[model samples]
Target chain A: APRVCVVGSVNMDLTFVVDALPRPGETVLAASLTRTPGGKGANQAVAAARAGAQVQFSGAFGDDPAAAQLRAHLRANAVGLDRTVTVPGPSGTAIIVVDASAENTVLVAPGANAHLTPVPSAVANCDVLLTQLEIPVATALAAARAAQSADAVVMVNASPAGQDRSSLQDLAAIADVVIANEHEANDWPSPPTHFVITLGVRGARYVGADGVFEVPAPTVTPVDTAGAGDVFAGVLAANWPRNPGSPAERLRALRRACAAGALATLVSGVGDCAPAAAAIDAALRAN
Target chain B: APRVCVVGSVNMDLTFVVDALPRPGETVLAASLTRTPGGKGANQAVAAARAGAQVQFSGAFGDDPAAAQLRAHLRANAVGLDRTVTVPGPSGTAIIVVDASAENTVLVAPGANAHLTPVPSAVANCDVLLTQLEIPVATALAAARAAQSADAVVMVNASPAGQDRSSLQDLAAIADVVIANEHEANDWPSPPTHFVITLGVRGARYVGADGVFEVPAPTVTPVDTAGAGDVFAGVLAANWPRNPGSPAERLRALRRACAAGALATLVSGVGDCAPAAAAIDAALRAN
Candidate 1:
């Protein structure tokens, strides 16, 4: 199993299930509410680890009560958080509103997560480095460069779209693989050398030096497709090195990753619903 | 029609329409996106105004660019802002995510809205004073008491559940009507003089001196149910004086308000989707 190092956000997702999108100047009664441990980094770390990869999570959480809860969640997930640092402020929190149809809106307060330091030296042994744009651009770039220098494949998921394209272009140049969805692709100048664009329902596209290849999603009714993309990126990182052939092999690996992600959507949460590696393998083999 | 004074939040709702809810620690791509002006106080005020009542909005907004945008939106919607104060801080904002099914999740930063003050003199002309717990409970109670002293009907929508109920019980005693959902109702010590419990699809119940009466929701396909409760409260405040008859007559008026609220679900937003007075009358007449 390849070692995956994830550097990104860690937040307590406060979710409210509402009937519909709230109107301007209105308060709607939430149907139900829940608080879950989550963050882009935490999600990917858990996904990679659960997918049978050695994973290390490097991020910053606060010394607050939520941080303690987050620490407990990470430990329970079996992801190595030994390198995780604690800042003196509130831990990052994403106020998420999930509608009845399992759609969500989120607002992220960077909090302690934004205060993360440079990537720890232990990441040098990582086979793949995964990061997202939930943190400062400078920090994301530092981690990417660190992984590149250490001969580890670097992947960046440019999420929370609408940031400056120039910043994404800069990171794209340093990233070995760039993962984006249709909305974020609009922010990029063009497709990168190794890029995966997730098109909901239409499946994902793998673009590299050779050409572009598409992976069709399996027919499954998704209950909560929340962490599908992160699952894809994490599983791709875990499976990428296993394909030892040329660029074509990388595309095959990307397909396998997409398969894992699509399978994950059949469940509910990122960690709670992610499909096992055996399930993904079986689905792919059956296809 | 009662003249309502709403002293509360005004926010620019930044929304992203996505396929599903994001998993714990995972990011998903959005399908579409939009930004609309919104706030709980503002929504209730608009709902009241649309339900055929004169309404004044009193709240603080920032001097930021976003505040300017919000002002433009309110001006366009005909929501009064002359008494709307401007604070020296960031404008309040709700980051929303709406899924394909029109369900949404939200994250809110109170920002300028947190600075809402009790300006009793400004609301002196009000006939009905409506308040929510989103603002400072002390200020809200003081405003309610002030309205009561001015001989105005004080109606409090004790929402955003889990607030210290002890502090709210006194205000509830003085309030002409206390509207609460199941969550907020859970905190109420006992029944007050006049109380309305809203149970979403199950409709609403009015508990008062005469007796307890249930109002059934009109049958309709709900598009986005956000802000329906606010609409119900606002419409009830507007129509309360029209029905000064027996408990059965008041129940009929409450049913009309519920029908209007259900009509709001046919559209997508809180304020924008609220049915016009004529449309509500038509629904009531049809029923």
Candidate 2:
């Protein structure tokens, strides 16, 4: 199993389950409300841990009371939080309003997440380093560089496509793999050799080889698709050690990640719904 | 001072200070993030308390961590919470995304607020009752009827005029004073005997037996307009005791409410910005 270190954001997701997204100046009543511990880095760390990897999560949490829920959820997921830092503001929150169709519109308030400036020493022990764009770009770059120097396969999930990060290309160039959703995939000026573009429901595309090869998603109706991308990035990092550096090895790893991502969609929220490695393997074998 | 009973919702506002409301599928970066205690019911209660009224607040809070913030804010403002109920879910939240113009779009998840099936018994000891449409209309009606029975004037701020509430007509019928903004005033089937319509920066209008009278808002650029209406309702309830059934008395109350509402706009957040009785009196005297 790969020893994984995730340097990224941890947010308390304030999720509203509504019939549809509200129009401008319109108020839509929600069917239910739930608070979940989530964020790209936190979700991926939990996903990697559940995917049979030993993981350490380095993140920043605010002193806000809700930060406890994020910390406790990560601890319960068996993701080590010994390197986590505390800041003096409210923890980051992703106000995710999920429509009846399970499609969600998210607004992230990067509170304490922006304060996470991870030390190079935090990622030195990992065989794989997983980072995402939810935190500051410079921090993600530092984490990737440190992991690369430590001989770890550095993977970056360049999601939430809009922000103009100055180091986007540099971060992707340094990472072993760059993972992004279809929208974020369009954001990069050029695709790196080991780039993965995830297509919801349709599956994912890998650009490491000659032509784009697809890993199809299983036919499961998703209750909520909030963290599916995080699960995909996570399973990819957790299984990287077994895959080595080959086209076929990476393809097999991506297929397994597709299974994990699929299972995650069958429920609401992240972490708890993330499938164990054995479950993912069973679902894959059954397929 | 009038004893005021507020039957409404209380929420920890997850406020995102953005430059503009994002277009559909667009992600707008927030300039800042803050968590503040807010909710129509809680805001009015705090407003009344600040305006020198003996206030009792009745509402429901989820077991979420931010419930403490709401409770503490109310207490600090001298709003009584002895009738407050605790429920099994997350606290209510107003995910307010404000733009540079201070124009806000809010998404409210009525978590514990939905569970607040308030008892008429809670509003028995009050001179006036203030409420908003944020909670269940039936609960608002019950409190209205009970407060009316106790000889306390029932005032309703018919905000968020979009919802198809079956009890809207009944709520207006039971109210001693009906308050609505421009959009809400347009939605009501017919104007009640005593109706006040807020005109935002243009000030407020009151239609009573005397005639149509406009109380222009005090001249000041508002920094944040989230709780202007709440302060309006609150100060109205607090000053209602000063005004008897006379038309001149009621118009005087409406003008004082406008001054209090204006003072609330000078700062961010809700509870703390609410002016005390002295400030409202001073502003009214200066005018």
Candidate 3:
């Protein structure tokens, strides 16, 4: 089994499920308000853990009341909490308004996550390192630097394109792979190695690759697409080590990751929805 | 010594201190995000607890992460946890976006607070029962009824000024006293015996033999005006049993309540700021 390490934001996601989104100056009564565990890094860690990979995560949370459950969530999913610092004040929080269409708009207030400075200890001895743009730009760069220095393959997910692109150019320059959805793809500089561009529900492909390189997404009825993208990133990182030096095997991993991504949408929240190895294989079978 | 039982909502207030209120389609960077304990009923209970009154609080919170802090806050302030119910979801949460001027726009997500039904056991044999409009409509009315049957004085503070005005008219019809701000004063059907009307910093008034008997507020520089009104209601309830059935002492209680309300503005967040009996007495003595 491969090993994966992730550096990203961990948030207590306050999710409101409503029939429709509220417009300007409009107040819509929500059907239910549920607090779910989320954050791109946390989601991806869970994904990698479910994929039978040894998953490690580095993040920061408050020493306040909400921190306990958020920490336990990581353990329940078998993601090793590595270099996780407990700081003063509240944990990172995301207010997600999920409409009936399974689309959500998230507003994140990086409480303690904003205070996280990279701990170089976290990046030591990692196989594949994955990082996201949720934390401050400097920390993301620090994690990438430490990962690169330790001779690990670095993958940067620029889902949230802006608010920190100033440091991203440098991080992207040193990264082995740059992963971005279509919207964020234009902002990132091309990496030296494989560049993954994800098109939701359609599939993902490496830039400047032939037809054999593109992986088609599995067709499934999605309930809530909240963490599907993170699932894709997690499984991709977990499956990174297989058939090393083979771009063809990388393509096969993309196909399997896409299966996890589609399966993730079948559940409501990101935590337990991370597909297990058998589930991914079964979906991989039908696909 | 009077015992006050409060049936209310306990919320983890995620407060953001920002430069200015964000307009529609605008995003403003906040200075800091702080998690504090709040909720109209809980704030009021803390006020009474600090005012040397025996306070019992019956509320419901989800078995979620943020519930621990909210529960502990009540105990630290000396509020008794009597018949408190634990539900299946996250506790109620309020997102308070406070501008530089201490003006705040609050968005509340009532999670497990919605599942709270009135518990007659919580209402059993209390001297005074206090409630607010933050809980379910039936719960407020049910609580009011239980208090009445137990021969407890029912005091309703319609602080939020929304949700269940129709039932409030019924609550007002039977309440020993009804508290409201000037804006919400119009909706309430005046109470049978005592009617408490608050006028922001201008002081409060009671309907009596003397036309519009007014209790002038203490002059104090205010840091935050968020839960000042709740403080007034809490102290008023705490002091309600004085000079039993002597309407003369009721005026003194309102005056002391007004002083406590003024003292509450010395700090931000409602927990530690609620004036003790000494602080309220000192302010009352000066006036």
Which candidate number would show the highest lDDT if scored against the true structure? 2
Task: Please give the CA lDDT of all the candidate structures.
Answer: 0.74, 0.81, 0.79
Question: Candidates ranked by TM-score, best first?
Answer: 2, 3, 1
DockQ values per model? 0.05, 0.44, 0.16
Docking class of 3: incorrect
Output the number of the DockQ-best candidate: 2
Which segments of model 1 are wrong by more than 4 Å? A164-167, A242-245, B1-287
Model 1: residue B115 alpha-carbon error in angstroms: 31
lDDT of 3 by residue, A31-133 (tens): 7777877888898899999998898899998887778888899999988986889989878887666678787655567788888898768777788888887
Of candidates 3 and 1, the better by lDDT: 3
lDDT of 1 by residue, B203-284 (tens): 8987888687777887888898988987887787776652133566567658877988899888887758767789988987
Worst 10 residues of 1 chain A by lDDT: A24-33
For model 2 the TM-score comes to 0.90
Of 2 and 3, the candidate ahead on TM-score is 2
iRMSD for every model: 9.4, 2.5, 5.1
Candidate 2 Cα outliers beyond 4 Å, as residue runs:
A23-27, A162-166, A209-211, A242-244, B18-29, B99-103, B189-193, B201-203, B208-226, B241-244, B265-270
**Chain B vs. true chain B: TM-score per candidate:** 0.88, 0.89, 0.91
CA lDDT of A87 in candidate 2? 92
Write the number of the candidate with greater TM-score, choosing between 1 and 3: 3
